[PDB]
Scaffold this active site. Structure first.
Site, PDB file in Angstrom:
ATOM      1  N   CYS A  53     -12.630  43.146 -20.158  1.00 53.36           N
ATOM      2  CA  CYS A  53     -14.079  42.923 -20.133  1.00 53.36           C
ATOM      3  C   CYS A  53     -14.577  41.739 -20.959  1.00 53.36           C
ATOM      4  O   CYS A  53     -15.768  41.436 -20.944  1.00 53.36           O
ATOM      5  CB  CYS A  53     -14.810  44.180 -20.594  1.00 53.36           C
ATOM      6  SG  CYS A  53     -13.910  45.697 -20.281  1.00 53.36           S
TER       7      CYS A  53
ATOM      8  N   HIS B 225     -22.870  44.825 -24.104  1.00 49.99           N
ATOM      9  CA  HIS B 225     -21.699  44.979 -23.266  1.00 49.99           C
ATOM     10  C   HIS B 225     -22.018  46.176 -22.362  1.00 49.99           C
ATOM     11  O   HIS B 225     -21.688  46.169 -21.178  1.00 49.99           O
ATOM     12  CB  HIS B 225     -20.495  45.258 -24.163  1.00 49.99           C
ATOM     13  CG  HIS B 225     -19.305  45.800 -23.447  1.00 49.99           C
ATOM     14  ND1 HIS B 225     -18.515  45.026 -22.625  1.00 49.99           N
ATOM     15  CD2 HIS B 225     -18.760  47.039 -23.439  1.00 49.99           C
ATOM     16  CE1 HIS B 225     -17.533  45.766 -22.140  1.00 49.99           C
ATOM     17  NE2 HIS B 225     -17.658  46.993 -22.619  1.00 49.99           N
TER      18      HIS B 225
ATOM     19  N   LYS C 262     -25.996  45.108 -16.915  1.00 47.12           N
ATOM     20  CA  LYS C 262     -24.944  45.691 -16.083  1.00 47.12           C
ATOM     21  C   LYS C 262     -25.502  46.827 -15.246  1.00 47.12           C
ATOM     22  O   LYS C 262     -24.889  47.243 -14.261  1.00 47.12           O
ATOM     23  CB  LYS C 262     -23.785  46.193 -16.952  1.00 47.12           C
ATOM     24  CG  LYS C 262     -22.590  45.242 -16.970  1.00 47.12           C
ATOM     25  CD  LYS C 262     -21.477  45.730 -17.891  1.00 47.12           C
ATOM     26  CE  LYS C 262     -20.505  44.606 -18.232  1.00 47.12           C
ATOM     27  NZ  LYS C 262     -20.585  44.233 -19.669  1.00 47.12           N
TER      28      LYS C 262
ATOM     29  N   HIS D 154     -20.084  45.907 -13.436  1.00 50.28           N
ATOM     30  CA  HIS D 154     -19.101  45.293 -14.334  1.00 50.28           C
ATOM     31  C   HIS D 154     -18.096  44.410 -13.594  1.00 50.28           C
ATOM     32  O   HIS D 154     -17.145  44.912 -12.995  1.00 50.28           O
ATOM     33  CB  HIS D 154     -18.368  46.402 -15.103  1.00 50.28           C
ATOM     34  CG  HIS D 154     -17.510  45.910 -16.228  1.00 50.28           C
ATOM     35  ND1 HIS D 154     -17.225  44.577 -16.425  1.00 50.28           N
ATOM     36  CD2 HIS D 154     -16.883  46.582 -17.223  1.00 50.28           C
ATOM     37  CE1 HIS D 154     -16.461  44.448 -17.494  1.00 50.28           C
ATOM     38  NE2 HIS D 154     -16.238  45.651 -17.995  1.00 50.28           N
TER      39      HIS D 154
ATOM     40  N   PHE E 216     -16.814  43.585 -25.129  1.00 52.19           N
ATOM     41  CA  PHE E 216     -15.772  44.399 -25.735  1.00 52.19           C
ATOM     42  C   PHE E 216     -14.893  45.006 -24.645  1.00 52.19           C
ATOM     43  O   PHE E 216     -15.277  45.987 -24.015  1.00 52.19           O
ATOM     44  CB  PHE E 216     -16.415  45.507 -26.568  1.00 52.19           C
ATOM     45  CG  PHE E 216     -17.485  45.012 -27.509  1.00 52.19           C
ATOM     46  CD1 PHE E 216     -17.272  43.889 -28.295  1.00 52.19           C
ATOM     47  CD2 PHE E 216     -18.697  45.669 -27.611  1.00 52.19           C
ATOM     48  CE1 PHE E 216     -18.245  43.428 -29.166  1.00 52.19           C
ATOM     49  CE2 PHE E 216     -19.683  45.213 -28.485  1.00 52.19           C
ATOM     50  CZ  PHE E 216     -19.454  44.091 -29.263  1.00 52.19           C
TER      51      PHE E 216
ATOM     52  N   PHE F 282     -11.101  46.489 -22.750  1.00 53.99           N
ATOM     53  CA  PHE F 282     -10.033  47.471 -22.937  1.00 53.99           C
ATOM     54  C   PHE F 282      -8.976  46.810 -23.811  1.00 53.99           C
ATOM     55  O   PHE F 282      -8.814  45.583 -23.775  1.00 53.99           O
ATOM     56  CB  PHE F 282      -9.383  47.835 -21.602  1.00 53.99           C
ATOM     57  CG  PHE F 282     -10.205  48.740 -20.740  1.00 53.99           C
ATOM     58  CD1 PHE F 282     -11.594  48.686 -20.756  1.00 53.99           C
ATOM     59  CD2 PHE F 282      -9.586  49.626 -19.867  1.00 53.99           C
ATOM     60  CE1 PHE F 282     -12.362  49.506 -19.907  1.00 53.99           C
ATOM     61  CE2 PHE F 282     -10.348  50.448 -19.016  1.00 53.99           C
ATOM     62  CZ  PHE F 282     -11.738  50.383 -19.041  1.00 53.99           C
TER      63      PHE F 282
END
Lengths: 403, 403
Positions: free
Chosen positions: A162, A297, A327, A332, A389, A391
């Site tokens: 991301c 985020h 978002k 995303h 932020f 994975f």
């Protein structure tokens, strides 16, 4: 030493150029639609953040033979950015001081799978063809744009889930600061396919309870959110040294005054507040003007959403900025999320308004310390911040300020 | 400001660690073997640069469940780098000044294909499972090592095909120069599978005429070479800030005194001389010492091999360094090639010898007036250079020197 954005391009679920994106942002218009593909897949998530545009023929025949969707989206975005930045061919081509740093979060699951399925059929190698590497390789997006656009400077991709395109931009800024490049195109792209999407559904990360009402699936901060809505697309910005930009009469959007990049070093897929806090703080070092707007985020996941708010509370305490998770509108786009959201941030800075945080029917309790704007509000912004932020506990945040 | 290598780890086709790898490089031993898997897939290339090691219980269940082979190889390599460096948890964990920059050229075609295959079966999502993203995503190698090793600094992966781990190291050096980090683990990994290998065979890049004699397939500079021999494995070096190293009494193999990163901006998959020339030159800027040994990119392909020679000659002229392509021994590990070859270079520097360029039964006409070392030769080396030119026209070269 100083890095400014002198041009931008974007192909996304809420727009095919910055003008359509603008109108979309101000309107709180969703780019989410129902997906037969995903449903036919066996996935429980049937909602998409799709790019509304037939890319067929949009790119040279001989050029696009090497690309996958992520590359196509990034290419078109770069075409835009070059035009926007007013860069003539003789100004950025075959120039050792001009580079490219762009990547994707997943490369091309569609063409990796295609190569495998093809090799296992009656035709074997002949059914695979000679273009699967450039399409499937992790460095596809950068490799596919550097050659056609005739880039001579740095050429490579950065991936960080991301946060990949955000880290791409920050790295671009560093090349300027290191005096290594005058111009660096930074961004990324991401294909939209069941091949990759099913992987996220398999780990329960995508929304599944709002397939009947697609536009309401992505609901960051809403008490009933249930995962993010996968999407695809591209984005690209022209990172340029201040003096070089001023010298040629370039139009400047903002200057990158802050860039944070940290690591959680704790949990996989799950975010730790500490880590995000350090990232934002690191982005704020040296920035003495307030943060007027924060583009979170906030992917619309139960844990992640309130974990980011908690970090914000630490970094800002009582001086918390106006917040909004675009978002809830766009979905995303993973690898393309970083640059696309930087672009939305830049547009809100340029046209003085704050895009709304839509679909919040019941603000999450853990979000009482508000200022999360749920309505398009006109305001004169000066300094904005964008959080990414991903994975693996990889964090990035950028701070852009009007000159 | 100054960067040095204070530790190294490697899992490769010619050795599961630096002591084993030293033996094979002195011996000129080949790590290439016949592959039933490849042949059985239907490929024309049946030769492998495989990692001779059973990793079964080497990594903790909770940690390795997220990894793919590329990650596993890089993890084991970091473990060795950590130990060979003198570092312990309390010194590299939960520390904001310690980071990780490592990636792979192809991520995990094996698990992207597995997810697709598993999704299409009757169970679907429940057969895919929740670990395919971290295994298949382009940032797998970095995400999978940052969390277990509790990394707090930078955390992301860089991909650039045959140059990914070299760019990873160069970027690590920049973080030190920017005063952002004290230690940065740099390297990468790459899985070995028909899933990905068939893609390269499909574009005719792999060797196919020497399946009967595997150890003779990889023959860089030989008049009868016919493509490279795919391989897999991992590598990792500890890039550290000089003063930090000295202060803790670290062992310093060398200092990275040069780092070039350029772009061809001309042809896909095919290399252009000029881009490489600029890369090497950019790497030797400021190095007042001559290059004693050059570890070429030389993958054993008809076009690529001689183009690099011409580039080198253009760069040095009548100052050509001793050259040798260790790929004739190891094969092309793609994303892992950059750091692994930097490691071989470091070992030759540390042990005063030049590894041989094997299998040159017939020297190509183009490699005329040059010092292509074909025999293990003892020599006191001081400054070495390693070239990495990947698909997409992305070049990287590193210059390492003794302190």
């Amino acid at each position: 030493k100083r890095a400014v954005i002198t041009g931008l391009g974007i192909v996304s679920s809420i727009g095919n150029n910055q003008q359509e994106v603008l109108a979309s942002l101000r309107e709180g218009r969703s780019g989410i639609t129902f997906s037969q593909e995903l449903k036919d897949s066996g996935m429980r998530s049937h909602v998409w953040g799709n790019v509304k545009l037939d890319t067929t023929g949009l790119i040279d025949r001989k050029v696009v033979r090497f690309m996958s969707d992520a590359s196509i989206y990034a290419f078109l975005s770069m075409e835009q950015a070059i035009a926007d930045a007013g860069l003539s061919p003789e100004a950025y081509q075959n120039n050792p001081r001009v580079g490219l740093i762009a990547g994707s979060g997943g490369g091309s699951p569609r063409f990796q799978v295609f190569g495998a399925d093809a090799m296992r059929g009656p035709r074997g190698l002949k059914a695979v063809g000679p273009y699967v590497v450039t399409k499937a390789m992790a460095s596809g997006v950068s490799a596919c744009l550097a050659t056609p656009f005739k880039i001579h400077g740095v050429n490579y991709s950065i991936s960080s889930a991301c946060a990949t395109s955000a880290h791409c931009i920050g790295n671009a800024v560093e090349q300027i600061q290191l005096g290594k490049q005058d111009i660096v195109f930074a961004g990324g792209g991401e294909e939209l396919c069941w091949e990759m999407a099913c992987e996220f559904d398999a780990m329960g990360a995508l929304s599944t309870k709002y397939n009947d009402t697609p536009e309401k699936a992505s609901r960051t901060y809403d008490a009933h959110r249930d995962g993010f809505v996968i999407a695809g697309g591209g984005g690209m910005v022209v990172v340029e040294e201040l003096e070089h930009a001023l010298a040629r009469g370039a139009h400047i959007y903002a200057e990158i005054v802050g860039y944070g990049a940290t690591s959680d070093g704790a949990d996989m897929v799950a975010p730790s507040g500490e880590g995000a806090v350090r990232c934002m703080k690191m982005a704020m070092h040296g920035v003495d003007t307030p943060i007027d707007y924060l583009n979170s985020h906030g992917t619309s996941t139960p844990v992640g959403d309130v974990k980011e708010l908690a970090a914000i509370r630490e970094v800002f305490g009582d001086k918390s900025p106006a917040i909004s998770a675009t978002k809830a509108m766009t979905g995303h786009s993973l690898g393309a999320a970083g640059v696309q959201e930087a672009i939305y941030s830049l547009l809100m800075l340029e046209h003085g308004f704050i895009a709304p945080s839509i679909n919040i029917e019941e603000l999450d309790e853990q979000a009482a310390g508000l200022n999360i704007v749920t309505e398009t509000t006109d305001r004169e912004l000066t300094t904005v911040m964008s959080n990414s932020f991903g994975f693996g506990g990889t964090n990035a945040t950028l701070v852009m300020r009007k000159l």
